[PDB]
Amino acid sequence: TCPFYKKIPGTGFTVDAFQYGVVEGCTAYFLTHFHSDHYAGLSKHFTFPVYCSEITGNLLKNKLHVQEQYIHPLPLDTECIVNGVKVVLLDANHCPGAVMILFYLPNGTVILHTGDFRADPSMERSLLADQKVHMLYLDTTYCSPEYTFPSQQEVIRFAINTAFEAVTLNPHALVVCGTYSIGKEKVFLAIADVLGSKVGMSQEKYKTLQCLNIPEINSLITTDMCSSLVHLLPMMQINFKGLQSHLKKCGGKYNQILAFRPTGWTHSNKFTRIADVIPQTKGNISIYGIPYSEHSSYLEMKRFVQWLKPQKIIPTVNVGTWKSRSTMEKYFREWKLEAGY
Numbered sequence: 001t002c003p004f005y006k007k008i009p010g011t012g013f014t015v016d017a018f019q020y021g022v023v024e025g026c027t028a029y030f031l032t033h034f035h036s037d038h039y040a041g042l043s044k045h046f047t048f049p050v051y052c053s054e055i056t057g058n059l060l061k062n063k064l065h066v067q068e069q070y071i072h073p074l075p076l077d078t079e080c081i082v083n084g085v086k087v088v089l090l091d092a093n094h095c096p097g098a099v100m101i102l103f104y105l106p107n108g109t110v111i112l113h114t115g116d117f118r119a120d121p122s123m124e125r126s127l128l129a130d131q132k133v134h135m136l137y138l139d140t141t142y143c144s145p146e147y148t149f150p151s152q153q154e155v156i157r158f159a160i161n162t163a164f165e166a167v168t169l170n171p172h173a174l175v176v177c178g179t180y181s182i183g184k185e186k187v188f189l190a191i192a193d194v195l196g197s198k199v200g201m202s203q204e205k206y207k208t209l210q211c212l213n214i215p216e217i218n219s220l221i222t223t224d225m226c227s228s229l230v231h232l233l234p235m236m237q238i239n240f241k242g243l244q245s246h247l248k249k250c251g252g253k254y255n256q257i258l259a260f261r262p263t264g265w266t267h268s269n270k271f272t273r274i275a276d277v278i279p280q281t282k283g284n285i286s287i288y289g290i291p292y293s294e295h296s297s298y299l300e301m302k303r304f305v306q307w308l309k310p311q312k313i314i315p316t317v318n319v320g321t322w323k324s325r326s327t328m329e330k331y332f333r334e335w336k337l338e339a340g341y
């Protein structure tokens with residue numbers, strides 16, 4: 001059964017609720033982004049209307065084979081009417097095609113669902129500036145002050161300079177990047193670009209990347225592994241066994257692997273600066289874990305909320321424990337008292 005925090009009251013609508021069967025009274029299913037915890041339950045047999053971005057609709061059609069007739073793509077930053085209710089989609093600064101949804105209820109309430117997001121000051125000059133939001137359904141993934149990480153710009157800078165140095169010292173080194181869902185594409189794209197190579201990958205991953213409307217993509221990626229010196233692999237293979245094995249297959253083209261695991265947050269953020277990060281090494285294989293996040297830091301989240309000044313906040317992440325729920329409610333109150341709303 002569908003939880004309350006996936007329901008938009010006063011409407012026929014749910015959000016990211018595809019794993020509950022037929023939801024009683026839901027007449028349109030919104031999907032915020034193509035990550036499996038959120039799409040769970042969609043397939044080619046789904047027969048109700050789905051509303052989402054263009055990119056999210058490309059993946060629905062090509063990867064889960066949902067029939068065209070039920071996919072309803074919407075443009076961003078545009079007032080649209082759905083079953084008599086005004087809605088707007090906004091960039092969530094998460095993975096490709098990830099949106100926030102504004103619902104303008106018939107009775108005058110305004111609701112913002114962030115879906116998954118990385119808060120940014122640039123959202124303060126979206127169509128959010130123009131009016132008041134009563135309810136915020138918030139991605140509270142890193143809602144605790146210990147969650148700090150660098151900007152995405154600093155992390156990419158670290159990865160580019162690391163890879164460029166290594167390969168210029170040893171032209172026979174191969175660079176490998178771990179992946180398991182969409183998002184974080186900039187990690188492997190920016191590395192390839194500085195190395196003058198295309199990114200090589202399996203057919204299934206190539207297909208996935210072909211749905212994301214990235215400009216000049218055909219110039220950046222390929223299925224011919226032999227022609228590329230940056231290879232993508234499944235995240236589970238980004239370990240010393242997985243990498244030695246993969247090196248066998250390259251057939252004596254390369255004598256060194258430099259690999260990157262893009263994670264979210266890890267406790268080595270409590271002590272270490274991005275500049276100071278070092279790999280784990282075994283023989284001719286080094287692995288760097290790098291804190292490239294697509295969720296709000298605690299401070300980025302706080303700023304966004306204190307700008308928005310919502311009347312009520314409903315968390316969508318970390319909701320299954322009382323300790324979490326209680327901790328989050330305390331920060332909400334602090335933030336409200338500090339800013340004075």
Ligand code: NI
Binds near residue numbers: 035094
């Ligand atoms: Ni996500």
